[PDB]
């Protein structure tokens, strides 16, 4: 019967729940007691970018760590310049509802997300001075939540019908379809070697896929509510999720289990974005209690909160040289802290 | 002004770009957005067959119809077979919510289960929408359509198989009015929003006049907060 095969699954679930306990001889907070604290980290609003007229929904830095795309729900997708506050391009979107954006590693393309589940790819360094659509990647059935770029020809889009997909761009088709979730996928992020990628779903589950083959290598269920944001430790051996449990949990990829949760008892609102700093010491996190707390990533204590936003904090990003962080809020201002 | 010859031309672009957002934010904020909720079979595609002026977009189809110099925008969220808790905050700041309930759903049972009749199904859909934390100051236009189908069904099948404690007669005027006040007793927020119901027919032309009369209310009520009277 159906229960006869599901009893094997609960036994296999009891196998892997047994193996993680056989390895956790001493947690993170007992092995790094003999470290110095990082001290208070106060960061001043160096720039502020005030072009949009709606809620900023996502952002992404270019890998030259100067340009910066930001996408709001008034149907605009503005490519800022972070050193001097300039708008390089203002790309008018076809569908005004945009739930994510992502900039190219080469600096050539930019792809809006969408609530109309079509991940349209824009071309920047083009002839004729425009920014026209390169290709619209229809084929999901839900909505779209986070779509990072592998390179200029492969884009990994999470969706809202529990299917993370990998597209080609010279042709419009998919190549794989990473299925295996139950609640809809809310965010993803690629490893620094772009061979693996994690994806935080809505059933308190985060799965480490692989890009080539297309199967889930490991799953990580540690939360209670949905996982709302995800990011990598900058070597690709650990990743931290963010939830509506107000708890950034730092997992890893070679010991299968959760290393540390970053909980504070005074915070009750969710997490919307998580981004590690470079060298992986300062885990930033953006709650929707209007703050943006800055957690040490090896001891669970806090540091200087980045207050200053009059609404939610919807997107973060540390530049690839680790220089600045920029937060995009639900009032229209981005603030490039430093 | 300590800037190079090209960088002086760069901020000339970024104030010509900034001019084309502030002269476009003053075009979208003059126009009225309208979420269009309801069940997928409850006459949802009929009320966009009233006035329609504007295949890949399987998620959200817009309808940019206008009336008496007012560019409305209806957002049919029909293709979203996903969790409403994750994208409904995108629609915070909508001007009014056009909800729809087929009036013939009192006796018509749900498809997947022979229980939780579609009037009770649409009521619990309406209670989650109306009392949502993102929709407080947004009024709810509620259409009761299929009213040319309802009044000849209650003549031959009673209403009390949907509501257990009705205790009333079986005319169209007194019973459909009970369903109408059945929905308006669902808001815990009584004075921060006002449900403008309506019994629209399938053939009449009066509902687009009605939705203009209920947007002119909530635009006025959105202006009383900004001017300081309310």
């Amino acid at each position, epitope marked *: 019967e159906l229960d006869q095969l599901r009893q094997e699954a609960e036994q296999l679930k009891n196998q892997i729940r047994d193996a993680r306990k056989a390895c956790a001889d001493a947690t993170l907070s007992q092995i790094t007691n003999n470290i110095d604290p990082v001290g208070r980290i106060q960061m001043r609003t160096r720039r502020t970018l005030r072009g949009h007229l709606a809620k900023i929904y996502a952002m992404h830095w270019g890998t030259d760590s100067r340009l910066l795309v930001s996408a709001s729900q008034d149907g605009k997708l503005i490519i800022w310049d972070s050193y001097t506050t300039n708008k390089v391009h203002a790309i008018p979107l076809r569908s005004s509802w945009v739930m994510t954006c992502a900039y190219a590693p080469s600096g050539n393309y930019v792809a809006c997300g969408g609530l109309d589940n079509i991940c349209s790819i824009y071309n920047l360094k083009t002839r004729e*001075g425009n920014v026209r659509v390169s290709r619209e990647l229809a084929g999901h059935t839900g909505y779209l939540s986070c779509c990072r770029f592998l390179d200029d020809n492969q884009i990994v889009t999470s969706s809202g019908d529990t299917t993370c997909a990998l597209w080609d761009i010279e042709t419009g088709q998919q190549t794989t379809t990473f299925t295996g979730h139950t609640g809809d996928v809310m965010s993803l992020s690629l490893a620094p070697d772009t061979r693996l990628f994690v994806s935080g779903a809505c059933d308190a589950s985060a799965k480490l896929w692989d890009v080539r083959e297309g199967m889930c290598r490991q799953t990580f269920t540690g939360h209670e509510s949905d996982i709302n944001a995800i990011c990598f430790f900058p070597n690709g051996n650990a990743f931290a999720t963010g939830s509506d449990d107000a708890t950034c949990r730092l997992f890893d990829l070679r010991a299968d289990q959760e290393l540390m949760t970053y909980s504070h008892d005074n915070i009750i609102c969710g997490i919307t974005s998580v981004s590690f700093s470079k060298s992986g010491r300062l885990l930033l996190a953006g709650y929707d209690d209007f703050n943006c707390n800055v957690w040490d990533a090896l001891k669970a204590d806090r540091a200087g909160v980045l207050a200053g936003h009059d609404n939610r904090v919807s997107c973060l990003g540390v530049t690839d040289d680790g220089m600045a962080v920029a937060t995009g809020s639900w009032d229209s201002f981005l603030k490039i802290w430093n | 002004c300590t800037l*190079s010859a090209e960088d002086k031309a760069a901020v000339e672009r970024s104030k010509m770009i900034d001019r084309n957002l502030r002269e476009d934010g003053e075009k979208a904020a003059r126009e009225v957005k309208l979420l269009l909720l309801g069940a997928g079979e409850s006459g949802k595609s009929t009320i966009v067959k009233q006035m329609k002026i504007i295949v890949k977009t399987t998620g959200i189809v817009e309808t940019h119809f206008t009336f008496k110099d007012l560019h409305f925008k209806m957002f049919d969220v029909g293709g979203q077979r996903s969790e409403r808790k994750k994208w409904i905050h995108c629609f915070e700041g909508v001007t009014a919510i056009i909800f729809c309930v087929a009036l013939s759903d009192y006796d018509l049972v749900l498809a997947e289960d022979e229980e939780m009749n579609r009037m009770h199904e649409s009521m619990k859909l309406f209670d989650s929408i109306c009392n949502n934390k993102w929709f407080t100051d947004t009024s709810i236009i509620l259409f009761l359509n299929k009213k040319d189908l309802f009044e000849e069904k209650i003549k031959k099948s009673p209403l009390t198989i949907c509501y257990p404690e009705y205790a009333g007669s079986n005319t169209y005027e007194e019973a459909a009015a009970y369903i109408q006040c059945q929905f308006e007793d669902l808001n815990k927020r009584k004075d921060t929003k006002e449900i403008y119901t309506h019994f629209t027919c399938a053939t009449d032309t009066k509902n687009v006049q009605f939705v203009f009369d209920a947007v002119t209310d909530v635009i006025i009520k959105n202006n009383l907060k900004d001017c300081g009277l309310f």
Partner: single-chain antibody
Framework: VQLVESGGGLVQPGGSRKLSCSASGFAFSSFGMHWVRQAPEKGLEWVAYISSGSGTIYYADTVKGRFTISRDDPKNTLFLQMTSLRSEDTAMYYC??????????????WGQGTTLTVSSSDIVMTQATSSVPVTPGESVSISCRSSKSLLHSNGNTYLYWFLQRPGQSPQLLIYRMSNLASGVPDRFSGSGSGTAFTLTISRLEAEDVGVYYCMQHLEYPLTFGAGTKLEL
């Protein structure tokens, strides 16, 4: 994409002639147009400029006040009206385009060029070479020394190199410094020093013949150099 232009012919001095540049193929309203002339024995000199949306208009010193410029965005045409020309304005006039943001490539596409024939504080750029002979295969370098320090205070050394194959219209080679334009091979590579510059060709073939104008862009008026000819 092209910028065909018309006008000119033969004009009596002191008169006037309206020069039109009908730019068809792109989005015109985002392109700050210039106007560069070429005397029939001399190099290139800058003449005019109008920014995007007709906001900022500069001029050269020689043509200040007597040359007026205008843009027509819906008619998609660019107008240069010349009042009371002298005999020192007989030249081929080029209608070039340029868009200015971070990481752009100004002066990228140059028009075909019309002829205008008459009847009878700024930074200088020298080019110490003139008319070098070169066989295909030898790595040749072209020097171009400035006078002011072209390195600004944000890392940029605004020195746009160029090329002009004989007969035809010029084209970009190297924008700001050691950046390649869209569609040039990897043989051309520049290396700067703030005042002294060098355009290195690693390997070269028979299509790379012509003159090589180095042009600054640090402040208006932007002066080309007297370019070095390449022969066989």
């Amino acid at each position: 994409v092209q910028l065909v232009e018309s006008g000119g012919g033969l004009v009596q001095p002191g008169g006037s002639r309206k020069l039109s540049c009908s730019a068809s193929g792109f989005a015109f309203s985002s392109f700050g147009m210039h106007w560069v002339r070429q005397a029939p024995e001399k190099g290139l000199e800058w003449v005019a400029y109008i920014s995007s949306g007709s906001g900022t208009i500069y001029y050269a010193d020689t043509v200040k006040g007597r040359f007026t410029i205008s843009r027509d965005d819906p008619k998609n045409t660019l107008f240069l009206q010349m009042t009371s020309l002298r005999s020192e304005d007989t030249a081929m006039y080029y209608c070039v385009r340029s868009i200015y943001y971070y990481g752009s490539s100004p002066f990228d596409f140059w028009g075909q060029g019309t002829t205008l024939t008459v009847s009878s504080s700024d930074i200088v750029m020298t080019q110490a070479t003139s008319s070098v002979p070169v066989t295909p295969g030898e790595s040749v370098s072209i020097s171009c020394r400035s006078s002011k320090s072209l390195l600004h205070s944000n890392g940029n050394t605004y020195l746009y190199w160029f090329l002009q194959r004989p007969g035809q219209s010029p084209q970009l080679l190297i924008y700001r410094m050691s950046n390649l334009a869209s569609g040039v091979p990897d043989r051309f590579s520049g290396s700067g020093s703030g005042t002294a510059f060098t355009l290195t060709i690693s390997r070269l073939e028979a299509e790379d013949v012509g003159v090589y104008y180095c042009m600054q862009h640090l402040e208006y008026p932007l002066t080309f150099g007297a370019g070095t000819k390449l022969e066989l």
